[PDB]
Amino acid sequence: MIKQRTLKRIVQATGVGLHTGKKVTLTLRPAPANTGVIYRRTDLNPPVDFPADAKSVRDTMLCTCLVNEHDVRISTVEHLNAALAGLGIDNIVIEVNAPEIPIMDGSAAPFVYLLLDAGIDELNCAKKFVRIKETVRVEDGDKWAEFKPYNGFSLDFTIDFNHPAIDSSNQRYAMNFSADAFMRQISRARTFGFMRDIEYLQSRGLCLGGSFDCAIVVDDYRVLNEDGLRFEDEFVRHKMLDAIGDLFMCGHNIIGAFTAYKSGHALNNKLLQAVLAKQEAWEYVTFQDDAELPLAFKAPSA
């Protein structure tokens, strides 16, 4: 059978919150079958749990947040969420003693190492996949996102950037998903922002953890980070990272073809909810014999 996975052991890391600028301790814990991904704030007393759910998502000015029934929040979950998808973790408890997940270097890579430290435990319960059956499309003016039937998981992302530091040949990225491909091509791609906007946010006591160490920062003309970019098309690779984290909010790997033009957190989530709400458009599937498992969702080599 192709089994659900959780962590072998509890692991922990610290880092700075993007918003508060304060030290945040992150703890990742194993969890039983079918419980899914649960974000938990332990700064509040009692602790507050936020099950990863497409309906709970809110796209804030910076990054994304989950909310509960009373509009308490936990922010900056999507990069870590992308690593969960990348490594094929299905059940996990993620705790922070703060209102946000630490920003780290702005990519998913530090979470990759952290998850590898924790190990993998297979649970005796079938892993459920969401298989696309109808074509579903959502749009926001010029922008659109869609899913299409496909015996795999592919992503085709076009960003439209008329910034001098983003050349024409670097506005589109396409990949067939796999754990290895995510770790190698995507996980290290950093978030990015505009210096004047960051400056402004900080003059109002926001984005206090922002630094060159946690983001690519550009002014009107160029990248300001002294080491420059990790990839020539780092910007769009990061948007792909963000899309993987957005889609994994439903807690399941999706078998289908993802395509988006100028999409982002709001639209990708809008697609995720549109797909799920349209009952005929999708179905759960499991794999009794491993050999049925499409290559995209094979266990990571590492």
Ligand X SMILES: C#Cc1ccc(C(=O)N[C@H](C(=O)N=O)[C@@H](C)O)cc1
**Residues contributing to the site for Zn ion (CB under 5 A):** 191, 242
Nearer to ligand X, 156 or 197 (CB): 197
Nearer to ligand X, 69 or 142 (CB): 142
User: How far from the centroid of its chain's Cα atoms is residue 193's Cα?
Assistant: 18
Catalytic status, residue 79: no
211 binds, among ligand 2CW, Zn ion, ligand X, none (CB under 5 to 8 A by kind): ligand 2CW
Nearer to Zn ion, 95 or 242 (CB): 242
Considering only residues 44, 119, 151, 194, which one is a binding residue for ligand X as defined by CB under 6 A? 194
201 sits near ligand X (criterion: CB under 6 A): yes
Three-state secondary structure readout of the chain: CCEEEEECCCEEEEEECCCCCCEEEEEEEECCCCCCEEEEECCCCCCEEEECCHHHEEECCCCEEEECCCCCEEECCHHHHHHHHHHCCCCEEEEECCCECCCCCCCCHHHHHHHHHHCEEEEEEECCEEEECCCEEEEECCEEEEEECCCCEEEEEECCCCCCCCCHHHCEEEEECCHHHHHHHHCCCCCEEEHHHHHHHHCCCCCCCCCCCCCEEECCCCECCCCCCCCCCHHHHHHHHHHHHHHHHHCCCEEEEEEEECCCHHHHHHHHHHHHHCHHHEEEECCCCHHHCCHHHCCCCC
Nearer to ligand 2CW, 125 or 208 (CB): 208
Q: What residues does 148 pair with on adjacent strands?
A: 257
136-175 footprint of ligand 2CW as x/- string (CB under 6 A): ----------------------------------------
Considering only residues 215, 272, 281, 296, which one is a binding residue for ligand 2CW as defined by CB under 6 A? 215
18 binds, among ligand X, Zn ion, ligand 2CW, none (CB under 5 to 8 A by kind): ligand 2CW
Q: Which stretch binds ligand 2CW (CB under 6 A): 32-40, 83-91, 211-219, 292-300?
A: 211-219
Least spacing, CB of residue 196 vs ligand X, in Å: 5
Nearer to ligand X, 46 or 141 (CB): 141
201 binds, among ligand 2CW, ligand X, Zn ion, none (CB under 5 to 8 A by kind): ligand X
Contact positions with ligand 2CW (CB under 6 A) in 179-208: 191-193, 198
The answer to whether residues 52 and 37 touch, using CB atoms and an 8 Å cutoff, is yes
Q: What residues does 4 pair with on adjacent strands?
A: 123
State how far the Cα of 39 lies from the Cα of 100, in Å rounded to an integer. Answer: 10
Least spacing, CB of residue 167 vs ligand X, in Å: 18
110 sits near ligand 2CW (criterion: CB under 6 A): no
Residues in contact with ligand X by CB under 6 A are 194, 196-197, 200-201
Residues in contact with ligand 2CW by CB under 6 A are 18, 62-63, 78, 191-193, 198, 210-212, 215, 217, 242, 264
